[PDB]
Design a protein around this ligand. Structure first.
Ligand SMILES: NC(=O)C1=CN([C@@H]2O[C@H](COP(=O)(O)OP(=O)(O)OC[C@H]3O[C@@H](n4cnc5c(N)ncnc54)[C@H](OP(=O)(O)O)[C@@H]3O)[C@@H](O)[C@H]2O)C=CC1
Ligand SMILES: CN(Cc1coc2nc(N)nc(N)c12)c1ccc(C(=O)N[C@@H](CCC(=O)O)C(=O)O)cc1
Length: 186
């Protein structure tokens, strides 16, 4: 209905995951920021939809599943029904966005958030239209097995600031990271 956005936390070597989990120790305010951005709707009586791939879903502790206050959609071609806790299942990202325009959800969803994995990001990314990427830069290297695709600076502009997103360097468990927002329209 509203805006299509991606949200990712990536290490300096572009890593987003390792053996089913994050490559760094848990960062509690990085998690807090993920939840405040995905859960806040810009219009009353609306909710945000969060789209993820099957291993992203299973990477979330079972006790926080489904993500609360959000419409949880799982992307999968192998699954027959949404996994336990999930609200929706689609076989592709267009089917997922085609569903948004179904009276079902059409008067219900403000913003649409893509939360992972790389294949989903790679795809939302080349998709046409207005897109924003919310990138948390974890400023160090971490052994990964899964990476974020390359941001094309000829298409995405790094914004100088964005309301509700801290512009300075954060630090936790001794890891420094900073929050960035990029925008596209093509
Ligand atoms: N740090 C961060 O910001 C993030 C970290 N992570 C971490 O990264 C990893 C998850 O990674 P990734 O491996 O990339 O996993 P995904 O979560 O993207 O899983 C891939 C599965 O999802 C389904 N799928 C994905 N894209 C599509 C599509 N376009 N159409 C239909 N089905 C699709 C397929 O399921 P099937 O095989 O069933 O068809 C595919 O096997 C974990 O390590 C997780 O903890 C994850 C996201 C964000
Ligand atoms: C592997 N993922 C992806 C993920 C982790 O961190 C991120 N950070 C950003 N910026 N982007 C992402 N896409 C993620 C996730 C794992 C677990 C939860 C999770 O438990 N979320 C609770 C967190 C609540 C809390 O931590 O207190 C929630 O309500 O969102 C979310 C995402």
């Amino acid at each position: 209905v509203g805006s299509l956005n991606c949200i990712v936390a990536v290490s300096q070597n572009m890593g987003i995951g390792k053996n089913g989990d994050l490559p760094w120790p848990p960062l509690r305010n990085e998690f807090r920021y993920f939840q405040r951005m995905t859960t806040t709707s810009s219009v009353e009586g609306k909710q945000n939809l969060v789209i993820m791939g099957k291993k992203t879903w299973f990477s979330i502790p079972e006790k926080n599943r489904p993500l609360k206050g959000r419409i949880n959609l799982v992307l999968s071609r192998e699954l027959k029904e949404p996994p336990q806790g999930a609200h929706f299942l689609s076989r592709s990202l267009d089917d997922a966005l085609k569903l948004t325009e179904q009276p079902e959800l059409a008067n219900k969803v403000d913003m649409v958030w893509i939360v992972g994995g790389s294949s989903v990001y790679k795809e939302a990314m080349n998709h046409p239209g207005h897109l924003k990427l919310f990138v948390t830069r974890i400023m160090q290297d971490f052994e990964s097995d899964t990476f974020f695709p390359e941001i094309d600076l000829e298409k995405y502009k790094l914004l100088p600031e964005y309301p509700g997103v801290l512009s300075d360097v954060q630090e936790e468990k001794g890891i420094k990271y900073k929050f960035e927002v990029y925008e596209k329209n093509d």
